[PDB]
Design a protein around this nucleic acid. Structure first.
Ligand SMILES: [Mg+2]
Ligand SMILES: [Mg+2]
Ligand SMILES: [Mg+2]
Length: 155
RNA sequence: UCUGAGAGUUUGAUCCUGGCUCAGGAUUAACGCUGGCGGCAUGCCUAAUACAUGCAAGUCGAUCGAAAGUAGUAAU
């Protein structure tokens, strides 16, 4: 049940020897709401083929996401170009405090309660890149225990 | 035990810097349209401009002389 949702449908174009070639570009986010989510941007002369190619790319590039108590473990800032997205853990009940591309990414990934803020640009592809970078840079509290020879997150 | 949502807009199309605008609240508010009632609360932000009129700090005869009125033949 890999649900998908459309984030942006731009109308890009080039110029030829007389006239303009117009193609639709779609930014699709595919997620199973259990820990797998990817993104795919595709261009085609028509919306259906563009959506098909974007879904194919999103399913080709899937990333693994780990959740702690339905939320993100520690506060992080994802950077990608001029877009910086701040994610912050939330207690169970606040729900998704995200809006737009971040909200799409978080819901399709499976997180329940996240605090988010877009501190930079508002271009959906770069916001998605920053969000994915922030979630991917995350550290589990068992990898750090293995690294520092602590006792499975014990004090 | 706190705790933060964004979008539109420069280009044939894209990224960034960057300004403008909107989505939310609030008032000692005013205006247009309309208008049934009750519980609380507020009501010259301007001319510290000028004011008709009527009220807004008096009380004590158990401090004191006197005076007036009502009763009483008088004293009282
Ligand atoms: Mg020619
Ligand atoms: Mg234009
Ligand atoms: Mg005044």
């Amino acid at each position: 049940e890999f649900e998908e949702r459309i984030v942006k449908l731009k109308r890009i174009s080039k110029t030829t020897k007389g006239g303009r070639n117009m193609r639709f570009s779609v930014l699709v986010v595919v997620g199973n709401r259990k820990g797998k989510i990817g993104y795919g941007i595709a261009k085609a002369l028509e919306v259906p083929n563009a959506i098909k190619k974007a879904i194919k790319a999103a399913h080709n590039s899937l990333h693994t996401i780990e959740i702690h108590k339905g939320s993100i473990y520690h506060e992080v800032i994802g950077r990608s170009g001029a877009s910086r997205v701040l994610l912050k853990p939330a207690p169970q009940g606040t729900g998704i405090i995200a809006g737009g591309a971040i909200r799409a990414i978080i819901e399709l990934a499976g997180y329940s309660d996240i605090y988010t803020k877009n501190l930079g640009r508002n271009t959906p592809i770069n916001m998605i890149h920053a969000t994915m970078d922030g979630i991917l840079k995350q550290l589990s509290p068992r990898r750090v225990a293995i690294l520092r020879n602590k006792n499975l997150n014990e004090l």
